[PDB]
Structure 1
Amino acid sequence: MELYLDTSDVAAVKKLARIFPLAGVTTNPSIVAAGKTPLDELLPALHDALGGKGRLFAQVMATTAEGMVEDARKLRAIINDLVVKVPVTVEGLAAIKMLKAEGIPTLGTAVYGAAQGMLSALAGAEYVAPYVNRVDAQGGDGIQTVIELQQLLTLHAPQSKVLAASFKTPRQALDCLLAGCESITLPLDVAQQFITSPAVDAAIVKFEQDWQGAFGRTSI
């Protein structure tokens, strides 16, 4: 399993990198924009925050296949372990094919349907990123879309992975993991919710009280 954070918050990555077993960080244009730091600075900072390891993802902005290939080269020049995110559009599919021929790894992003996602894998994308919450938000069934996508890759493009993205609640991310997605990228709030629990905290308090009751101390 590859666990990613979906963020441009370098300090938060550093903090969480000692907690979670992170595979790296994913970005998208909005996430990059929120942090107000250009990629030529952000990407090496994230690399450092991870402990000088991990895989980064960053997205092309161009609207032609040729322009997207140019963007991909620029991104790959910034840092070594970098997968290029390409929106799965007409021009984006064409770009994914060209990038396959050139040996630049890609992720098919902005996926709102299973067939669209499968096409990006067949075209050469190593990862396919459905926008789970966006599908939920717009009156669809994001988890069903993930289940279908994962089925398509398993059947038809088994070397490609689902990288599930776009979460507002832990349950969405859990459901993606149960569907078999081999990679996932979490926003910071959902990531933290996985490891915050009133039930767990209460269990620990009770253990401490019992221990103190028996031994007159809270330590071994």
Structure 2
Amino acid sequence: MELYLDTSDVVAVKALSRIFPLAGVTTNPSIIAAGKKPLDVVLPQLHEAMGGQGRLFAEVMATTAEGMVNDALKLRSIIADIVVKVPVTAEGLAAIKMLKAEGIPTLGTAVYGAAQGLLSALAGAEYVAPYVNRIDAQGGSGIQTVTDLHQLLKMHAPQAKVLAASFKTPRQALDCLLAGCESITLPLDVAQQMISYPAVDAAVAKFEQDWQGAFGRTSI
């Protein structure tokens, strides 16, 4: 399991990296844009925020396969081992094949269907990123798409990994993980919810009270 945060918030990443067992950070264009720092600024910052380890992801912007390959080369010049996200469109598929021939690792993103995602993996993508919540919002089942995609990769491209993305609630992430997703990337709010629970807090408070009641202190 590779656990990622889906963010460009460098400060939050450094703070959460001591808490969570993080494999890295994923970004996309909207997330980069929301943070306002350019790629060649934020990427190295995010790399530093995890102590110079872990895996980063960032997305091409060009519209033609050749442009996307050139984006990829730029991105790799910024972080030498970065994984390059390519949206799974006709040209994106073409770019994924060309990038496979160049030894540049890719992830097929903006995946709204299982077959589509599979095709990215067959073209060479190492990761495929279905947009779970988007699919849920638009009247589908993100979980079924994921389940299906995961089945397809397991049968048809077993070195490729699902990187489940787009979350509004912890339950979605849980269901992706239950479906066997080898990787997942969480926005900050959902990640925080996943480790903070009133029932857990009440259990700890209770241990503290019982311990006080018998020993006159709450410390060991």
Contact 1:146–1:179 (8 Å) recurs in 2:
yes
Which residue does the alignment assign to 2:215? 215
> Does residue 1:104 correspond to 2:127, yes or no?
no
Between the aligned residues of both structures, percent identity stands at: 85
Question: 1:118 — aligned with what?
Answer: 118
- What is the number of equivalent residue pairs in this alignment? 220
Aligned residue identity for 1:87: P
After TM superposition, give the deviation of residue 51 of structure 1 in Å. 1.2
Q: What is the CA–CA distance in structure 1 between the aligned matches of 2:44 and 2:158, rounded to whole Å?
A: 31
Q: CA deviation at 1:81?
A: 2.3
**Residue type of the alignment partner of 1:129:** A
Q: Which runs of 4+ in 1 moved over 6 A?
A: none
Q: Which residue number in structure 1 is paired with residue 168 of structure 2?
A: 168
Partner of 1:211, secondary structure, is: helix
Relative to the length of structure 1, the TM-score reads 1.00
Unaligned runs of 5+ in 1: none
CA distance in 2, matches of 1:28, 1:19: 23
- For 1:189, give the aligned amino acid: D
Q: CA RMSD in A?
A: 0.4
- How many Å separate the matches in 2 of 1:209 and 1:92? 59
The one-letter code sitting in structure 1 at the alignment partner of 2:181 is C
Corresponding letter in the other structure for 2:57 = F
Q: Which residue of structure 1 lines up, in the alignment, with residue 141 of structure 2?
A: 141
Name the structure 2 match of 1:201: 201
Letter in 2 for 1:47: H
Which residue of structure 2 aligns with residue 179 of structure 1?
Answer: 179
Q: Secondary structure at the match of 1:85?
A: strand
What's the CA shift string for 1:47-83, capped at 9, x where partnerless?
A: 0001111100000000000000000000000012200
Residue 139 of structure 1 aligns to which amino acid in structure 2?
G
8 Å Cα contact 1:130/1:164 also seen in 2: yes
Structure 2 length as normaliser, TM-score?
1.00
Amino acid at match of 1:97: K
Instruction: Give me the whole-angstrom Cα distance separating, in 2, the residues matched to 1:217 and 1:7.
Output: 41
CA contact 1:54–1:81 (8 Å) conserved in 2: no
Other-structure match for 2:20: 20
What is the identity, as a one-letter code, of the residue corresponding to 1:147? T
- For the residues of structure 2 that align with 1:212 and 1:55, how far apart are their CA atoms? 45
